[PDB]
Structure 1
């Protein structure tokens, strides 16, 4: 197959999944699942399209649009849209492939997809973003729908963009339906959806801590290093603070902002809100680092990730982008006494990082190990609450915050227990060793999908 193009991010995600499936008894019990893997890893459909749009000077601009409709055995295609200058097919295929198995772990009927554009929101006006969204949806519209494919946000796609997108879909298709999630509260949105992805990461990690320490420890007083400062990072940070943990770092594409006293100090909700308001306006953390409220409390490090700069730390939540924890950063976190690392970002750890965490787990009993959880497990609360938003739209009713948050909590608990239990069944660790959450989540997500595909005649 030397005709196939090289897609490094997709191949990375595929290879890690495949390796975890091989390092188990799955293919001894079900060798025919190798056929399922070969089939599932070729997307059902991909749409690529030109997006021509007008800037504020009246000039023609051209960007590339995509929607990867990876798998639909379990439900309509489901997953976000990414507007970022790196975007290409390789990146969206990694994301879409991940999404299949992430969605499977929620328990809801959602197939996997992802899309977006190489349009860069940075440096654009709201008007330019509006015109781009209008043009983007003009083509995307014909390929999506409440029972076909339901997008949502991701990097570069917030409730603002989902609004422009929805309005254009409505205008084109003359239908008001759950074609997108992450919608506004008066026009079919769900309470808790803004909070859901980062809340879920934290909810998942609570279970990891409970399990590893037999209930002795929690987030109370733990030091948590977070990266990113967007939707996932913001609400992860807020949930950590609400549970009495201390957030010692955030970051953006230009640098890291770290409390000067990492043993005892934390970001506050007010500080997070200030950062969030910069981010609505597509500005950098660097802008506020000399204000009174920040200069004395924090150190800003241009060009650096937080991991080697936070001193001793208990929990790490990479929450920005793929491949943002290197192997060396992983070794630093281990040496700093970090015991829990969960991907808020999809494929947030490099392979070298994962290997370092999983070798540590295998070498250190119980609470002495660093325990690594993959994004398909930890990030799944976002998509789950999107599924609940679809359910609300279908019912034509709106649920309470308490009702949605309660379901979110149950879904994350189930997702942890499924990964744990599946790893115990198929990749039983040595006595006193924590089961691999990455292996278990991968096997659990995959076998659900492979079996539904078999039932539906996708492979035989």
Structure 2
């Protein structure tokens, strides 16, 4: 059928981005794979006294523009090719919001749901130990991702600080505020999505007051996003978690759903009448925002989507063949490398505050974040409509342009 491989799909779009920007084959050969990939084995002493050895990855795509940036995720399904692909997305993310960053990513093949606080801390410290030679505040700056949070950032920051013999808060982002974290971090991604949703609505003459929104997924990003749209006067008509979906044409009570909400963001289990995820994606609405897993809009349902605007809050919600379909149909698609750039942008701000040793207040971070998301959306949208190309390809051109120019300037090509 169609290509669901995340790594080769990203390469195919990056090849076309570099082609439309005028680069020859050498530039693609330099960017189609990360410059560095470190596979690592971490022995960890478990609570029962036994020893478990975990496989970890740290990928570094390109440090042409600056140090690399990207979070570390703990999941049993972490794979090498997924880490490589996600690090390229980080290059594209940073290029879109014009950060002095290259792309990086990390991952550990493990199940934290089956581990204790003491075991996760020792795995977290053993991860920094195993990769410390190629990371640092000026080399490679991790952050939170799937199943990692501020508490794990705190251990990784402490472990790196111990080996360095001084405090290095710039090594890692997403930290607790007391350890040099940044205000506005928890809501960074949902804020950027909210900004980009507002701009897409302007470009299609949709008023947020009364706008019908459905959001797939009720995690950290999906729930924060549901509360922002509710506060802006929009009707969040569709909401889902991993187990099911509920829907009301006049607007659900987001405050009711957020109160009795699971620690994993599960609420549909408390209801008798649910409507599942396959149907929620095909609901009638103005704005459809997937914020769950990947490959939810996949050609088979791409023609059945009733939204006029689709904003990728999660990673890889719609396949390549689906973006093609959604484009012919006239839907305004906002790619994930642009829509979810708010997380990278505030992480960047945290790293800058660590560099200076001087920290910004809530209003300053939000003002800086808004100008970034606003200018980035205009650049991607202008490129797409001007060149008559889809928004994902247009976003990859905006995102990869700086790394290619830097690679050529530095003599790498």
Q: Report if TM-score (shorter chain) is over 0.5.
A: yes
Kept after mapping to 2: 8 A contact 1:21/1:439: no
Q: Counterpart of 1:180? A: 172
Q: Counterpart of 1:349? A: 318
Kept after mapping to 2: 8 A contact 1:308/1:332: no
Gaps of 5+ in 2: none
State the secondary structure of the residue aligned to 1:115.
strand
- 1:313 has 2:285 as partner: yes
Q: Counterpart of 2:245? A: 257
Task: Give 1:123-134 correspondences, 5 Å limit.
Answer: 123-134=114-125
Question: 2:391, 2:352 → 1: CA distance?
Answer: 29
Alignment match of 2:218 (pick from 229, 238, 243) = 229
Question: 1:7, 1:143 → 2: CA distance?
Answer: 31
Residue deviations 1:120-179 (CA, integer Å, cap 9, x gap)? 222333333223212222212232111111000111112122122212222222232210
Task: Give 1:31-430 correspondences, 5 Å limit.
Answer: 32-177=23-168, 178-213=170-205, 217-252=206-241, 254-259=242-247, 261=248, 263-269=249-255, 271-272=257-258, 274-275=260-261, 278-279=263-264, 285=266, 289-290=269-270, 295=271, 299-300=273-274, 304-305=276-277, 307-308=279-280, 311-333=283-305, 337-361=306-330, 370-425=331-386, 427=387, 429=388
Kept after mapping to 2: 8 A contact 1:255/1:300: no
Q: Counterpart of 1:453? A: 407
Q: Counterpart of 1:438? A: 392
Gaps of 5+ in 1: 1-5, 362-369, 430-434
Q: How many residues align?
A: 410
State the secondary structure of the residue aligned to 1:63.
strand
* 1:421 CA drift (Å): 2.2
Q: Counterpart of 1:432? A: none
Question: 2:256, 2:360 → 1: CA distance?
Answer: 28
* 1:306 CA drift (Å): 5.1
Question: 4+ runs of 1 displaced by more than 6 Å?
Answer: none
* 1:452 CA drift (Å): 1.3
CA RMSD of aligned residues (A): 2.3
* 1:273 CA drift (Å): 5.2
Kept after mapping to 2: 8 A contact 1:33/1:450: no
State the secondary structure of the residue aligned to 1:348.
coil
* 1:211 CA drift (Å): 1.2
User: What's the TM-score once normalised by structure 1's chain length?
Assistant: 0.83
Kept after mapping to 2: 8 A contact 1:193/1:382: yes
* 1:457 CA drift (Å): 1.1
Question: 2:281, 2:226 → 1: CA distance?
Answer: 18
State the secondary structure of the residue aligned to 1:194.
coil
Q: Counterpart of 1:364? A: none
Question: 2:309, 2:411 → 1: CA distance?
Answer: 40
Residue deviations 1:240-277 (CA, integer Å, cap 9, x gap)? 2222223344444x422323x2x1132424533543x5
* 1:384 CA drift (Å): 0.6
> CA 1:229–1:372 in 2, change beyond 3 Å: closer, same or farther?
same
> CA 1:43–1:62 in 2, change beyond 3 Å: closer, same or farther?
same
